[PDB]
Ligand binder design. Structure first.
Ligand SMILES: O=[N+]([O-])c1ccc2[nH]nnc2c1
Ligand SMILES: [Ca+2]
Ligand SMILES: [Ca+2]
Ligand SMILES: [Ca+2]
Ligand SMILES: [Ca+2]
Length: 63
């Protein structure tokens, strides 16, 4: 979890941004358009501030 968050947190600012997540999904070859990743990010973003923080990320991985 910790290690995975750091991978996706490209700029190391303690958040996964939507753009960072789009880079992650593109690097993994996930069958999702950019728009669908934006929706995935938005759903993961519990507090709605535009960033996926570590707590929201762990709650994601619990799915
Ligand atoms: O932040 N995310 O919305 C999110 C969602 C699914 C993921 N799978 N692997 N990393 C992920 C990140
Ligand atoms: Ca970041
Ligand atoms: Ca949200
Ligand atoms: Ca919060
Ligand atoms: Ca958030």
């Amino acid at each position: 979890l910790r290690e995975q968050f750091r991978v996706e947190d490209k700029d190391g600012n303690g958040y996964i941004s939507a753009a960072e997540l789009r880079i992650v999904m593109t690097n993994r070859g996930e069958p999702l358009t950019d728009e669908e990743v934006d929706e995935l990010h938005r759903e993961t973003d519990i507090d709605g501030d535009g960033q996926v923080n570590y707590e929201e990320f762990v709650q994601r991985m619990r799915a």
